[PDB]
Amino acid sequence: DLTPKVQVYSRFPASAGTKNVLNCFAAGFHPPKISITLMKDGVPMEGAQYSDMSFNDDWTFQRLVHADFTPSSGSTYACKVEHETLKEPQVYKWDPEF
């Protein structure tokens, strides 16, 4: 099996009170079954949309999850990932610079 490689990043350079999109991309994993949840202040973000599961030329699976958001000072954003390679769900915080 292969553990997912996860990046969390926004569509545009973020700015407090300016509309944006938060992206969580999981890749390089096998088998394809995986949960990916975008989180805000410890709770699942509303409005999340899931790309079709796909795989790359070297057979590893990948998936893009995205939600519209307006980052505010004081909120925290993360992507939580469960996959059979992980003993527990892994929380990847959004670094608001990325």
Binding site: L2, Q7, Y9, R11, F12, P13, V21, N23, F25, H30, P31, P32, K33, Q49, S51, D52, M53, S54, F55, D57, W59, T60, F61, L64, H66, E97, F98
Partner: protein
């Protein structure tokens, strides 16, 4: 260069249960997919359906659905313990040359397992184990199917490709210019060039020190390209420096002329 690619995958959970998915791609433009519950094909681009008559679509759908169904049946009939995953990647590529490349590969547990040989019209065993050896001999035995696969790959896939290049030319030729910012992270200082919004995917992001390209070393990381949801892409590149002038240079076909972003 253009490519039409059909992707399929299947997790066999037990002897009676299999979760299938599939995707149709024209370069990185998603043409459609397989409804993992009903198995009906979904069409994502408006130029697709009118590009061929209904009867052609009917034959394409029925051949896709037979492929998927027969795949699952063959595996269950001839396999090795549950759970496991098979994948297929099937398609053709046209160079500007006019040169055709075809491909029809099956993977097993994420590694090449069987590969079609177009000229001989047979199968190459890709894993050095009994399961792959069995699969190769089984598929070697399907002479007639293999004759038909040859035509599907070399004639019908290519013909449909040429037609899709024309029908979907607006998608294929779509361009979106990159936007780039540069900022520094505490470290030595780590300079970051973050580029987003670009389409198509090929791009070249390099660092200049006094107008001069910084050579590769472990001080310079260029990251991996990341997708956005609106079919544009993002890249980050970094340079460990010591507090010379620095700028990030972004070259992209949407620009003809490059983006030059100084570090301040």
């Amino acid at each position: 260069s253009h490519m039409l690619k059909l992707l399929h995958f299947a997790t066999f959970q037990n002897s009676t249960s299999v979760l299938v998915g599939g995707l149709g791609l024209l370069g990185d433009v998603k043409m459609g997919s397989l409804d993992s519950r009903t198995g009906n094909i979904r069409y994502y681009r408006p130029w697709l359906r009118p590009s061929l008559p209904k009867g052609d679509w009917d034959v394409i759908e029925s051949s896709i659905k037979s492929y998927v169904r027969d795949f699952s049946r063959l595996v269950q009939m001839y396999t090795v313990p549950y759970p496991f995953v098979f994948q297929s990647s099937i398609g053709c590529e046209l160079q500007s040359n006019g040169t055709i490349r075809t491909f029809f590969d099956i993977a097993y547990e994420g590694q090449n397992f069987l590969r079609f040989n177009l000229d001989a019209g047979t199968w190459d065993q890709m894993q050095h184990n009994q399961l792959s050896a069995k699969a190769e001999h089984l598929m070697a035995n399907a002479s007639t199917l293999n004759e038909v696969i040859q035509v599907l790959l070399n004639d019908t896939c290519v013909d449909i490709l040429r037609l899709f290049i024309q029908a979907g030319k607006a998608d294929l030729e779509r361009q979106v210019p990159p936007m780039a910012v540069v900022f520094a992270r505490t470290a030595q200082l780590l300079l970051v060039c973050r580029v987003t919004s670009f389409y198509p995917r090929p791009i070249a992001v390099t660092w200049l020190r006094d107008g001069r390209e910084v050579p590769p070393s472990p001080a310079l990381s260029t990251g991996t390209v990341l997708p956005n949801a609106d079919l544009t892409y993002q890249l980050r590149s970094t340079l460990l420096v010591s507090p010379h002038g620095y700028a990030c240079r972004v070259q992209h076909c949407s620009l003809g002329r490059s983006l030059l972003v100084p570090w301040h």
